Amino acid sequence: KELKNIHVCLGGLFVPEAYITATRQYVAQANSWSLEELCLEVNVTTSQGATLDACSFGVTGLKLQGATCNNNKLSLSNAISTALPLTQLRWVKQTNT
Amino acid sequence: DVWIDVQRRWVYLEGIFTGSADIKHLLPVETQRFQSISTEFLALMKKVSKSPLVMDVLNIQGVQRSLERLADLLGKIQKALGEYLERERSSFPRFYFVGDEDLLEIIGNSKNVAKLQKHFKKMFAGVSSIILNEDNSVVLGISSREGEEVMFKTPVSITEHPKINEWLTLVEKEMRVTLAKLLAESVTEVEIFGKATSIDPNTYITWIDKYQAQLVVLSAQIAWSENVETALSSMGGGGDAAPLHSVLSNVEVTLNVLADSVLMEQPPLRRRKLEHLITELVHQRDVTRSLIKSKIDNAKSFEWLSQMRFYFDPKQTDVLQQLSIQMANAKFNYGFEYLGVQDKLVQTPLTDRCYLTMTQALEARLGGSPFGPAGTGKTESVKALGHQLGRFVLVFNCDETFDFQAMGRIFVGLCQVGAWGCFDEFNRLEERMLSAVSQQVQCIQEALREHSNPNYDKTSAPITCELLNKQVKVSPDMAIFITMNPGYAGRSNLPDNLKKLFRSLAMTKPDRQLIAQVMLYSQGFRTAEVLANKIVPFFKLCDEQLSSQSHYDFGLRALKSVLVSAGNVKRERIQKIKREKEERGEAVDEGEIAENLPEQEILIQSVCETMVPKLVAEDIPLLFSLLSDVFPGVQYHRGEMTALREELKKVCQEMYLTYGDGEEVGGMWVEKVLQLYQITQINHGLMMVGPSGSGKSMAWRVLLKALERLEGVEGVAHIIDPKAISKDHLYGTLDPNTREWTDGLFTHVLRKIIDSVRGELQKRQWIVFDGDVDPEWVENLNSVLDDNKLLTLPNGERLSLPPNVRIMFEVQDLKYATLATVSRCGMVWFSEDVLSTDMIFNNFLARLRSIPLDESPMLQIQRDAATIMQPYFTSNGLVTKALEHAFQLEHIMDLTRLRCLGSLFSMLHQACRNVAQYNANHPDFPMQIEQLERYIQRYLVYAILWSLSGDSRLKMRAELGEYIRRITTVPLPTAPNIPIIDYEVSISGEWSPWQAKVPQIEVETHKVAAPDVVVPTLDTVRHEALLYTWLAEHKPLVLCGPPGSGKTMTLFSALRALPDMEVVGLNFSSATTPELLLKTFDHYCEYRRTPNGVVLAPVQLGKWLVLFCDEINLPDMDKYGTQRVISFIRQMVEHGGFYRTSDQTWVKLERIQFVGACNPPTDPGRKPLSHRFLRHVPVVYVDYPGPASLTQIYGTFNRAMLRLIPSLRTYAEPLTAAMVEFYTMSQERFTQDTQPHYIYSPREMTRWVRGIFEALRPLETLPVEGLIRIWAHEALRLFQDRLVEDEERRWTDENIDTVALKHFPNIDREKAMSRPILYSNWLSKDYIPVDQEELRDYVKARLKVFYEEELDVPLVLFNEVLDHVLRIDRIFRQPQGHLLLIGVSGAGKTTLSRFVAWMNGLSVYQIKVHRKYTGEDFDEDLRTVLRRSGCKNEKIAFIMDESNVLDSGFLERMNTLLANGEVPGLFEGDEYATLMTQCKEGAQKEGLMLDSHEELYKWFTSQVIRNLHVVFTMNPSSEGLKDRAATSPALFNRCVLNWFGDWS
Amino acid sequence: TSIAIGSAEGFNQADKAINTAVKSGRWVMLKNVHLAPGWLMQLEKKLHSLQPHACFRLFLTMEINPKVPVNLLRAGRIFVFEPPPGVKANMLRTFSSIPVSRICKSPNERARLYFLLAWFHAIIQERLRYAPLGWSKKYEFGESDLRSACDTVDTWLDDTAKGRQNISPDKIPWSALKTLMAQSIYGGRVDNEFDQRLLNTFLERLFTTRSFDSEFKLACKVDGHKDIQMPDGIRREEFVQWVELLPDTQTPSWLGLPNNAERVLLTTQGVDMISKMLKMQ
């Protein structure tokens, strides 16, 4: 259970694309859903001021190129890259809306 | 030079004119001319055969004059035949797809059409045969492979047009016309089916059964296009109520009828028609929805123009032009070519995008180039578009041999017929060949562009592009397509001028979700959308989560494999249910069966049958978690193939294997065999990946026999090692001059199966490629492993893979294979855990208890012996625990489980033979069970020690011995300190130390340091017995160790105890190829045709040939990590034979074994041997003798040498210490890290003792100071000559003084170590020391004579020159004394060698290298030298320079010459006889009588060794020397290296 | 006479064509001569000891690779072909290559379409310099794409306007052009979803009925608050004149990229000039 609450750096993993699948599997297994009907929602918050629910996974080290994220909203900027403090990957059911 | 050409020309022309008895009806004038030529040939044979003498016929006049006339006549008629072939090819251009020999077969067999039925496959798209009446004079129609047939409206007879071409023209015209007329009727019926609220299933199915699979789909497309066009025309007013909803409604109701039809059982032909109609109508439904959603109300809107529209004009007089297919602004006319029943493709958006881009390119009169990763759908989309427009699409698997001439004839064939060419793997061509082809493609395109101009008229001259210096008519339907995978290994770069000729298109992400949904929907799967939305994300997650393995492939091909397997499983499950419904009760309802069918369970079963077998052990839990997560609540249990399992039990028992079910021993292997069977059913291309010794070969061998006894179909397997032969020998070669195709190995095997003279299609044929896989050779099988199931050759020939042939590969890894090959073959992964160690132990014991060793008292000994080792051969037993610990030690080569076990079993086999020999030697008292128990138990520990630690240093041999002593219960030697490796097991059954087998011998004085004299030591006696055990079993072995350690000496010493073995020396280099072994086989062995096949055995009957490869790991690895000769040797060891490329016949070796020698793989220039080759060969590590051993070895040599002078006998002990100490210091001080040639070994010590012995031989008495001077002089000539830097020479000079003074305290230093140490036998008869001033005056006088008689260039004499001429003179006075002079050019290396050679009477020979010098000239120069120095007994100093090496072949022949003294392949053919005549004549002059050729060659070799001296001069390059240390290893261990360098 | 080098017969044709041309006076071109570096040395020796006709010319198209013999390079005049330095230079090259009679045809709106094609081709091609940002990989957006695009414009404009002197901007088949350019001509080389998304953005922004208005902006916020304005001309000469009057102050904001996309590249090239100036001292 503790392994869920740790924030990993996707750049520091040998296969970062496997982590996304692993989190996708964990959420579906916990809620008894299906893998093919889960979509990804991203919520950018501060590292210290963040809460992780049963479906949110923390990711650090993501860099936003040419844009700044304020209140989970992007705005064009002249900076080469802006470091996102903490990214919460939340898995929710597909809505097809 | 004229008789042979005329003889050959007459031979094949006679066969052409005799095989084709009807060729005279079409070739009247030349038939009479040939009859006159035939009369002349008969007259020639009636005159020349009377006198069987060349002299009797050369004097007859009128022979050469008539021969020239015959040659002109033969050429003229041959040209006329060639002009006739092209003229006949001009009419009915489909003849461009048949070969010239095949075309004459059609020409001469016009009377009988039965022989013509086998060629219609390769002139027509889907016409496999023609239907004829009972009279075989009227062609009623045509037929396809699937059985579908087309009946001509007006049948084409052959009587009205016997001309094969004319009536072959009419059937092609009739097929197009009758297909146009049938389509016109079909569209009329489907128009009634259209614009209707409801469709009756009975009427719809009848119409489907009435027309061909090509016409039903086309009729549906035409009806829908007209309905939408009419609906759009009515809606053209804008803002009107939409009747387009009716068009969508009409499609949906027709889809419902089709969807219910596939649910019930249908005939296979109707079912394919049902599937094609569903696939198209689904596309029509999607398009109509898109039109409705976008509110398209104009027939000219691009949302409708971009879609493919079909227009039918019944008012058109020409039925061929009745149908027009339009996409965007591109307009095409249906070709009406009979395509048979092809597999349609779900029209996914990417396929549509592909259709738009390709059709845009065709309108622009340039080809299309779809590119992307493999599996996307490039070739199929190109083929589908061609089949959509009714074109003839030819698929060619391009590769490097598709040269300019080969492609031109293909383009000529396409242009005349008007076909489509899909050149897959176009970038696999050479870059220069890609550039040259761009000219032909440009010429064709420009001709097409002028064809499309409205000014041109059909009446005006037809557009003709220039192809291959000829005017070739270009049909407007001609097209080029080139699929390609950029970035893949083995692929070239397309030049920019060629790339601008094609409209590229990225085919990277196929729409997997749509392809599946439609495929499942057309197969009768209810809720196909649910399954598609589950199976496509599953494959995406598998690609991400699963580990990255070289044999993994989860692309479209894998999804397709699953979907096709899903359809097969559902049909089988329905049949199984139906068979249950007939036995239990009698109620059968197809509607109910399809209703309660576990479709998800079927899909999982297909996934487990296809995806699971290739999974590694760590990845199986991940995939099964994905299956349970993606498909929750459903589980699948694999069916127990009990029918096959019993057959596996019988085959495994009869081949001494271990069988198990589930978790029992051998259980995992059986599941792998069963998985292999399932892959065979659904895939025609297989691979068995997994580490060496994982049971792969036993898996498919047992499966082949189990299937043979189960299904009753005989199994035939052709095992081919692809990398053991060149690619030309594997697939074939095309002659660049005569354009004649010589079949390769694989092509000959596949062609033989297709022809089936001996009923080949009735047997299960498995072509196994047991070898390494790289994109160089395996991509030629891309079209074979693809659906095309076609093998395309550069000569245009295409061979279809028969349904009973499976292409299988047995590989250990796929780290070099590209994704194209990986995705084309079902993968079965054999991990090392599959074949457990207990599994191998049971196999060895079962074979030991059953197969007698001699060919019974032998078998009884084996059975008693096997029971004794039985407790030690169990899980967690003595052997298994020792094997596990042996993996933790350090070995000179990589350790594999099967190599250790293979060595161990051979030793235990020798133990049983030892027992029988004891019984034979003691007939009255056979060895009892107690003595046998003690002997076997002790020998087992002895065999274990020498098998698991034979290839490790002394420390690891002791470590394994200490570990064994802790765990065994067998009685062991009780010595507190002596390791167990020091003991042998006597035949009586007790441990005996090896020290008892080593005596302190006294070598004879005249045999000091002789090549065949070995002083026995502990290491010598241990390895001699070890090699005896392996050599007596005829198992190949490899000796590993540093050069000079004694690998060759030990083997020859061991072979002396075997009088039935003759050793043949082979010297491998970096350029070594299997040709070197083949040349040895020709000289020493012969081919004979036994009833069981061709057998290669040595000429000497009763003697075993031992091929000793001197440097087995030196041959260069290609860019894919494979040594061709090693793969060749591995084939002849594992399979006991090789393939003769002359006629592609398997040659089985008899009475031949191999012995290998090599430096450790860590040495520079040495490559590690493959694990599949090391499995068969035990490795024994022969290390340098220790200081104690060196003192014993050369203390005996020194004692024998010093017996010449009794006064010096007391200095034998200190002298040996001096040589050993100085040699050790020089070995430590100078290493191979500094210079490549800094190699010091006991060979230097042997040369040291021989050097001192030769100096002391003639001298009667010599003081101690004299002996030190000789000792010091020999040290300088051995350790100082090769030194590079001056500081190193000073180090040697100083330490020589220090070493001599340390061990010889009371000597006269100035008398014994005066610095100008010079020795020469020039001033006097003996090899006494000489003064520098006296030597200089002597050389001055001799140089003056040298100028008068020889080279007249003056020389300036200095101290270095006097030293150098003395060193060169030393080498010239030795047998097989070759020199390697390294120094800056112009330093006098050649002029000194010539001077010294003239001094010693040697004849100087230098090769006259010019610009046109090649390999043939060098061989002639070599053979001249060998003939002079081997037959005429003339001493020759062969002087050769580095600049004289124009090729790697030059060094290879010199490499063999330096070490062996003879090149095995140098004298072959007629000249071998002349050499034997001179060798016999030369032997007669000497005084020896020799009769057999075997003894004459040995005398010739001995003469060349004694006489020929090779002087090699080269510049002192840093990297050049390192390269020369590998390409010509004999330059650094057979030649004395002298570093002249620059002038000081 | 154009001959593709690389085959044995190609060498014989090259020798025959040169021998015929030096006396007759025609032209001979040899393509991809860098694939036969050994034969090039023989060609250079043959050319040196030769006095051909006055009008004879020999062209050797090649790729810039070190395998080309040094002697051949010294004996001939070298021309380096590469993508034009800037948007202004790229448009000028496009207009010069296209024949004047092709642009000025029956519909007066054809000239504007070629200008948009020239601008679109320039913007697409000069985003390749900033390869990680402007695209995702070095696509070969070349002259062949422009020729196919011009043919598509010619084909569909003639189809819609049957010889009429003027065609309404709304009647121009914008969807026909936009779809073909994004799926067949320029979209064929695009192998990525996001690159295809970017390509669709440019085509939809440019090829629209509002491109014929006087207030159309080719680019926005190039520097400060100024933006590139669509020319108000209707003839080919007017558009070429507008290109020649470009400010010669091109920044990545012309292509839509941020102005700092060239900061790294210009720093590296500026440093490289120092090393080049230092290596020949």
Ligand SMILES: Nc1ncnc2c1ncn2[C@@H]1O[C@H](COP(=O)(O)OP(=O)(O)OP(=O)(O)O)[C@@H](O)[C@H]1O
């Ligand atoms: N079912 C079995 N029962 C007992 N022994 C077996 C069984 N299967 C294989 N073996 C033994 O294991 C070894 C398998 O050799 P095989 O050539 O089949 O393996 P492989 O992995 O194909 O080898 P390579 O990779 O070198 O081609 C042999 O010693 C064989 O006798």
Ligand SMILES: Nc1ncnc2c1ncn2[C@@H]1O[C@H](COP(=O)(O)OP(=O)(O)O)[C@@H](O)[C@H]1O
């Ligand atoms: N649109 C499609 N619908 C169904 N199967 C397809 C489609 N496109 C490709 N395939 C399948 O893909 C497999 C590989 O063919 P393809 O991808 O064309 O090979 P390649 O990549 O070598 O050109 C075949 O089984 C083929 O039927």
Ligand SMILES: Nc1ncnc2c1ncn2[C@@H]1O[C@H](COP(=O)(O)OP(=O)(O)O)[C@@H](O)[C@H]1O
């Ligand atoms: N026990 C021994 N008795 C006599 N000579 C030995 C002994 N061990 C090594 N030598 C000497 O070492 C040399 C071994 O060289 P060789 O076996 O040809 O090396 P390699 O096999 O590595 O080419 C021989 O010349 C031999 O004189």
Ligand SMILES: Nc1ncnc2c1ncn2[C@@H]1O[C@H](COP(=O)(O)OP(=O)(O)O)[C@@H](O)[C@H]1O
């Ligand atoms: N010791 C020497 N004194 C004078 N001239 C020399 C001497 N050694 C070499 N030469 C010159 O070098 C020439 C021959 O060079 P050669 O021996 O063929 O060079 P390499 O040793 O590289 O083969 C002769 O013409 C001779 O004049």
Ligand SMILES: [Mg+2]
């Ligand atoms: Mg095997």
